[PDB]
Design an enzyme around this catalytic site. Structure first.
Site, PDB file in Angstrom:
ATOM      1  N   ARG A  79       1.078  -1.467  -0.553  1.00 25.73           N
ATOM      2  CA  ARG A  79      -0.682   0.108  -0.108  1.00 25.73           C
ATOM      3  C   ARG A  79       0.659   1.393   0.057  1.00 25.73           C
ATOM      4  O   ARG A  79       0.590   2.175  -0.426  1.00 25.73           O
ATOM      5  CB  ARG A  79      -0.764  -0.189   1.113  1.00 25.73           C
ATOM      6  N   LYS A  94     -22.540 -15.607   2.966  1.00 25.39           N
ATOM      7  CA  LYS A  94     -23.854 -15.328   2.660  1.00 25.39           C
ATOM      8  C   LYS A  94     -24.706 -14.395   1.237  1.00 25.39           C
ATOM      9  O   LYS A  94     -24.016 -14.337   0.180  1.00 25.39           O
ATOM     10  CB  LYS A  94     -24.557 -14.007   3.782  1.00 25.39           C
ATOM     11  N   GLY A  96     -14.145  -2.578   0.969  1.00 25.03           N
ATOM     12  CA  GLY A  96     -15.308  -2.123   1.484  1.00 25.03           C
ATOM     13  C   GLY A  96     -16.058  -1.402   0.145  1.00 25.03           C
ATOM     14  O   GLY A  96     -17.391  -0.823  -0.334  1.00 25.03           O
TER      15      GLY A  96
HETATM   16  N1  LIG Z   1     -17.399 -23.484   0.256  1.00 25.66           N
HETATM   17  C1  LIG Z   1     -17.357 -22.244   1.490  1.00 25.66           C
HETATM   18  N2  LIG Z   1     -17.290 -22.396   2.873  1.00 25.66           N
HETATM   19  C2  LIG Z   1     -17.376 -21.446   3.498  1.00 25.66           C
HETATM   20  N3  LIG Z   1     -16.646 -20.763   3.458  1.00 25.66           N
HETATM   21  C3  LIG Z   1     -16.133 -19.982   1.957  1.00 25.66           C
HETATM   22  C4  LIG Z   1     -16.687 -20.863   1.082  1.00 25.66           C
HETATM   23  N4  LIG Z   1     -15.549 -20.122  -0.360  1.00 25.66           N
HETATM   24  C5  LIG Z   1     -15.297 -19.285   0.025  1.00 25.66           C
HETATM   25  N5  LIG Z   1     -15.378 -19.095   2.005  1.00 25.66           N
HETATM   26  C6  LIG Z   1     -15.465 -18.224   2.615  1.00 25.66           C
HETATM   27  O1  LIG Z   1     -16.203 -17.256   2.566  1.00 25.66           O
HETATM   28  C7  LIG Z   1     -14.994 -15.952   3.563  1.00 25.66           C
HETATM   29  C8  LIG Z   1     -15.666 -14.808   2.768  1.00 25.66           C
HETATM   30  O2  LIG Z   1     -16.933 -14.376   2.885  1.00 25.66           O
HETATM   31  P1  LIG Z   1     -18.156 -13.250   3.132  1.00 25.66           P
HETATM   32  O3  LIG Z   1     -17.354 -12.594   4.208  1.00 25.66           O
HETATM   33  O4  LIG Z   1     -18.793 -13.149   2.077  1.00 25.66           O
HETATM   34  O5  LIG Z   1     -17.039 -11.538   1.951  1.00 25.66           O
HETATM   35  P2  LIG Z   1     -15.949 -10.847   2.164  1.00 25.66           P
HETATM   36  O6  LIG Z   1     -15.049 -11.905   3.313  1.00 25.66           O
HETATM   37  O7  LIG Z   1     -15.457 -10.612   0.760  1.00 25.66           O
HETATM   38  O8  LIG Z   1     -16.543 -10.263   3.192  1.00 25.66           O
HETATM   39  C9  LIG Z   1     -13.336 -16.179   2.840  1.00 25.66           C
HETATM   40  O9  LIG Z   1     -12.872 -16.239   4.364  1.00 25.66           O
HETATM   41  C10 LIG Z   1     -13.799 -17.358   2.374  1.00 25.66           C
HETATM   42  O10 LIG Z   1     -12.511 -18.427   2.621  1.00 25.66           O
HETATM   43 MG   LIG Z   2     -20.437 -12.825   4.445  1.00 29.84          MG
END
Ligand SMILES: Nc1ncnc2c1ncn2[C@@H]1O[C@H](COP(=O)(O)OP(=O)(O)O)[C@@H](O)[C@H]1O
Ligand SMILES: [Mg+2]
Ligand SMILES: [Mg+2]
Length: 416
Positions: free
Chosen positions: A38, A215, A396
């Site tokens: 960064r 989610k 974000g």
């Molecule tokens: N099949 C899966 N089951 C559970 N978690 C998962 C799966 N695929 C990816 N992930 C995880 O979801 C996490 C992020 O999801 P989310 O929190 O919705 O997105 P962000 O991190 O962009 O906010 C990551 O750490 C990733 O490892």
């Molecule tokens: Mg989520």
């Protein structure tokens, strides 16, 4: 609009003091810098200013969440001034505050070529406009104090540059409160605007969105907005199991399931059909006996179901093929969210394989845009940053753009 903004290349800096908002929110281990990416990223905007005869460059940023209390033992920017001097080949003066009479005097009329780094903006509650006291209670900033904080920042330069895309979604004092006649995006922000404008206003076609995450319910506006723009959408990651349980009656074991998202899956598919969007879901999976890096692993399909106890943590080989088919058809791609648990090697193949396809796509002229946060982390982990068109610098902020929102920091920039 993202297309009508003043940028640093169009800003006359000769003999001017430039107050520049940067993203120096680097990862730390006891106030020592583990990744300086960064900091390197801001160097082009700083050097442009110096090379075009700026009188000074005053750098302001935050680090961590001090939540409006001074925490100079834990979240001081002082180590960044050392790192920056390494990267610029120039002395950097570090000040132990970012506002007030002593800082304004240091910045009033410095020697030609001076680089100054201010202390953490978020040591003052007036930056975010709210925070926590040392007892953990909520406090809000007072209007007259926010005014004084903003006025003091505005004293430190003649022109303003924002090169902190990662904070541009926040209506914080350093993003929207600097009152100078010219307010320009620096070269990092220029790249963000150029790529996301293309994407959201006039994409190349076919336009594919690759959406992953855990989610469904917190990504509804993202999916809905992207369904207004794209020709094809891959849905992967943990959220896919909600779609598959609803649409196919799949047995999903202990895989993530979003009860409230489940109630709108058919509504999303409905909008996709109405707009002629092809949805590619996964058809096979790498399973795990628990949510752990060293879990035992297995395999499943939609037709087989996932055994009770076990969860799908990556897509499988036939899914990778279907995903690659969509990548092959695309002339533009936005990728927000890995398609499996890429942090853990056993569950990273689907995401790495898709990244390989995305890199090959870029090689043949696909415009490929990687959202900030986890997808950007994958590019750094596998050294693909220079092999895709654009890796966004703000998780974000890039998500809010993709949801269709206006970013207060971009809006605050001068037009034309
Ligand atoms: N099949 C899966 N089951 C559970 N978690 C998962 C799966 N695929 C990816 N992930 C995880 O979801 C996490 C992020 O999801 P989310 O929190 O919705 O997105 P962000 O991190 O962009 O906010 C990551 O750490 C990733 O490892
Ligand atoms: Mg989520
Ligand atoms: Mg995600």
């Amino acid at each position: 609009s993202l297309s009508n903004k003043l940028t640093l290349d169009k800003l006359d800096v000769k003999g001017k003091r430039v107050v520049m908002r940067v993203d120096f929110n680097v990862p730390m281990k006891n106030n020592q810098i583990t990744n300086n990416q960064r900091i390197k990223a801001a160097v082009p905007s700083i050097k442009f200013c110096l090379d075009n005869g700026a009188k000074s460059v005053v750098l302001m940023s935050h680090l961590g969440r001090p939540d409006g209390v001074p925490m100079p033992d834990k979240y001081s920017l002082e180590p960044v001034a050392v790192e920056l001097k390494s990267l610029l080949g120039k002395d950097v003066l570090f000040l132990k505050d970012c506002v007030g009479p002593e800082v304004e005097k240091a910045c009033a009329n410095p020697a030609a070529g001076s680089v100054i780094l201010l202390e953490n903006l978020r040591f003052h509650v007036e930056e975010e406009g709210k925070g926590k006291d040392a007892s953990g209670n909520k406090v809000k900033a007072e209007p007259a104090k926010i005014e004084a904080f903003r006025a003091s920042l505005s004293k430190l330069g003649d022109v303003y540059v924002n090169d902190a895309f990662g904070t541009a979604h926040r209506a914080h004092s350093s993003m929207v409160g600097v009152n100078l006649p010219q307010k320009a995006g620096g070269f990092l922000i220029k790249k963000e605007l150029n790529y996301f404008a293309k994407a959201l206003e006039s994409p190349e076609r076919p336009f594919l969105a690759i959406l992953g995450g855990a989610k469904v319910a917190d990504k509804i506006q993202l999916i809905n907005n992207m369904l207004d723009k794209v020709n094809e959408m891959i849905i992967g990651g943990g959220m896919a199991f909600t779609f598959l349980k609803v649409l196919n009656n799949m047995e999903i074991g202990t895989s993530l399931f979003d009860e409230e998202g489940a109630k709108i899956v058919k509504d999303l598919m409905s909008k996709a059909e109405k707009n002629g969007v092809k949805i590619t879901l996964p058809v096979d999976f790498v399973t795990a006996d628990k949510f752990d890096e060293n879990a035992k692993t297995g395999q499943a399909t939609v037709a087989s179901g996932i055994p009770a106890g076990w969860m799908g943590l990556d897509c499988g080989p036939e899914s990778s093929k279907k995903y690659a088919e969509a990548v092959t058809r695309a002339k533009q791609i936005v990728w927000n969210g890995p398609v499996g648990v890429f942090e853990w090697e056993a569950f990273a193949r689907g995401t790495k394989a898709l990244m390989d396809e995305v890199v090959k796509a870029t090689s043949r002229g696909c415009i490929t845009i990687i959202g900030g946060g986890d997808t950007a982390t994958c590019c750094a982990k596998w050294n693909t940053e220079d092999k895709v068109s654009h890796v966004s610098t703000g998780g974000g902020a890039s998500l809010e753009l993709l949801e269709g929102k206006v970013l207060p920091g971009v809006d605050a920039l001068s037009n034309i």
